[model samples]
Target chain A: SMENLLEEVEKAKVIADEAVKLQKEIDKRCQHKIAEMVALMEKHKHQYDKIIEERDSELGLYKSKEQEQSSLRASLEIELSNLKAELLSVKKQLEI
Target chain B: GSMENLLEEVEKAKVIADEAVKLQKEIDKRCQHKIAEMVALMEKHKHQYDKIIEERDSELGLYKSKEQEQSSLRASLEIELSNLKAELLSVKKQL
Candidate 1:
């Protein structure tokens, strides 16, 4: 009957108003406060992975570079000593 | 012997593997709730974006840029959160 349909529609509207207010109330909290917190947590999850990967990769990078530099350093030092020894070996280059 | 000590470690490891799944489930629940909120807000957002902005340029409502960050962040966050469920499942099977 039309009466039944009208009564149900009115009931629906009444319930709808209550639901809308409740939603607004909850949306206020979810809108920014928790969103900021979730953002922070996710940011750190990425940061946690970032620092660890960077720590290991940076150390490996420096380790190999140091080894490479040290080898070159040693060779230069050896050549320097050889030059000194060779200078000592020269008798002013004049065995006239 | 250290063999006994080592075996205890495996037992404890199993406990964590089990507990991880439980913790993952709880997170899964909360993740769904957050995502559901975002989804419902999205529908509400259909025409409200322009209206909220037009009525007030210096707006403090969902039409602002801050209005957007929640849904975007929540979507990505839930996916990552879901991956934990997969990860912990892997932990027990392969670890």
Candidate 2:
């Protein structure tokens, strides 16, 4: 009976040891997986941010170009109208 | 009889078995919870990624339209500038 007690004790000790080891492994694996996930998240975040920045820069350039073109168009229109008016006045003087 | 000793041992074995079962159940529950959390997080991330893609695509379309307008304006302005220059040259010749 005493031998049985010692045997049972040894078996229990082994089981407890294995359980602890398994738990430790689980913890380590979980931590590693979580770290990997976090890294992926950060990478994606950076990509998203970069895309947004690029979009903003392109939009800014587009707006600047639009404004420049519009201003040029306005100036050219004014000049053309003035020229037409001058031509009409010349025709009137000649008729007189 | 020696039956009492045997019964005591049996009782001890039963107790140990019950404890092991309980521990196993707890571990299973924790694993399930972790798996559920991971799935939820992944789903959320996917949704966010999709949204970003959609918004980016829309903005790109907007930029393209604006660029087209800019090009048209540029062509019109160039034509007008040429006409004005020609008129100015004609006036100078007359002078």
Candidate 3:
């Protein structure tokens, strides 16, 4: 009976050890994803700032400059929207 | 003999139980600590993220209003350009 109790306790310790390892792994993955998402958002922000500045500057000078370069404007706008949507999804994932 | 064996078991079980209890306490302490650290990080980032989002939205709104103005302005400019050309044509016809 004493031996059985010891056996059970030893097993319990191993499980506890595994629990620590699991928590550490969770911590690693969470931090990694968080860092990636932050970098992505920074990139998105830079693009937005640049595009908006250029748009404002050009449109300030020429009335139809935006319509003239509509292709480039559309591309950047689409990319930015997609990136924003993805980042929002990432935030949701992080929330969970 | 069985009674003696049971008594030994009782003593041994008590020591292991104590160790087990200690391990549990350790887990509880670290669990609270780890959750605090993790949750704090998430919360901090979430605040920063929301800040960025709000700033970006406001900035984008400024540009978007300009874009709308650009559309209307472009339409006006084109019509004016056509009207000026038409005026020139009328003068040529008179000549």
Candidate 4:
């Protein structure tokens, strides 16, 4: 009877050892999955950063170009007004 | 003799039962530790995700505002350009 009990204990120990091994494997797999997820997240973050940087640069260029165009238009408007006045003055002189 | 042997067997069985209970408790504790670690890692990742999302959202808002301003400027410039072209043409006709 004592021998039988000893055998049962040995079996239980073996089962416990197997459970521990299996748990370790599960933990390792879970860690691997987490690492993969972190890598993917980092990749997405880099891409987003790149896109935002590009957009910011484009916005700056567009603003500067627009400003230059506005300045040019203002100068051209002034010149046209002066030319029109000159034409009107010449016409009045002709009428005299 | 038989009774003595049976009593010894009962004692051995009791010891084995105690050992089994101890092993189960150890396993439970280790499992709980793993779960806690996982929870902590997930929370850390979630924080990083939230931060990235916030930054991206702010950048997108800035881009949209700039785009809207550019559009408004273009609209105003289009009208001004047209008027100037017309005036130039009238001046040439008079000349």
iRMS of every model, one decimal?
Answer: 31.6, 56.1, 44.2, 57.7
TM-scores for every candidate against the unseen true structure: 0.33, 0.42, 0.36, 0.40
Which stretches of model 3 miss by more than 4 angstroms? Answer: A1-96, B1-14
Checking candidate 2 for backbone clashes, the offending pairs are none
Least well predicted 10-residue stretch by lDDT in candidate 3 chain B: B1-10
Interface DockQ of each model: 0.01, 0.00, 0.00, 0.01
lDDT of 1 by residue, A1-96 (tens): 544644555565556557656856788877668457545555554554454445556657756875786576556556555554554445344332
Q: For candidate 1, what is the TM-score?
A: 0.33
Supply candidate 3's per-residue lDDT for A37: 75
In order, the first chain's TM-score in every candidate is: 0.55, 0.65, 0.56, 0.66
Residues B9-91, model 2: lDDT tens digits: 55565566557656755875687567557555665665686665566567867866875786576566556655655665676
Q: Please write out the lDDT profile of model 3 over residues A1-96, one tens digit for every residue.
A: 544644555565556557656865886697578668767877655655555446545546544543455555456556655655665566566656
Give the higher-DockQ candidate: 1 or 3.
1
- lDDT by residue for model 4 (A16-92), tens: 55765686588669757866866687776566555545655665875687578657655655655565566556656
lDDT of 1 at B65: 68
Query: How much is the lDDT of residue A54 in candidate 2?
Result: 64
Give, for candidate 2 chain A, the lowest lDDT window spanning 10 residues.
A1-10
Cα lDDT, all candidates: 0.56, 0.62, 0.60, 0.62
